[PDB]
Design a binder for this molecule. Structure first.
Ligand SMILES: Nc1ncnc2c1ncn2[C@@H]1O[C@H](CSCC[C@H](N)C(=O)O)[C@@H](O)[C@H]1O
Lengths: 48, 49
């Protein structure tokens, strides 16, 4: 997992989010994923 | 069809600023959709059109 950080380094430095193309901030995404109990659902699906 | 020289189905002469502005806004809105097309892509697409 070393080229990923390369690409988000590229994305951060030069994308120019402006207004037409913005991204959901990572805290919001993680809150959505945890509020759905995604880890628990994945564990239960794998375990059964 | 818009026959050239036809007195009825001719080309719309006598246009004002308001029509151009309304075009500008809607075209910037309809062509961008919901983020489908970039602003610069739209710009040179209209330049060519
Ligand atoms: N059917 C559709 N109509 C309009 N936009 C769509 C679409 N399907 C996908 N999209 C895309 O959805 C994006 C909305 S913003 C994308 C969500 C968030 N910023 C994120 O990165 O996760 C737009 O950039 C658009 O390109």
């Amino acid at each position: 997992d070393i080229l990923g950080d390369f690409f988000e380094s590229i994305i951060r430095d030069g994308f120019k989010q402006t207004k037409g193309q913005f991204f959901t901030p990572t805290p919001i995404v993680k809150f959505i994923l945890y509020a759905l109990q995604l880890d628990k659902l994945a564990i239960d699906r794998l375990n059964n | 069809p818009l026959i050239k020289g036809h007195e009825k189905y001719d080309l719309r002469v006598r246009i004002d600023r308001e029509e151009i502005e309304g075009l500008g806004r809607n075209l910037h809105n309809v062509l961008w959709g919901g983020g489908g097309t970039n602003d610069s892509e739209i710009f040179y697409s209209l330049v060519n059109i």
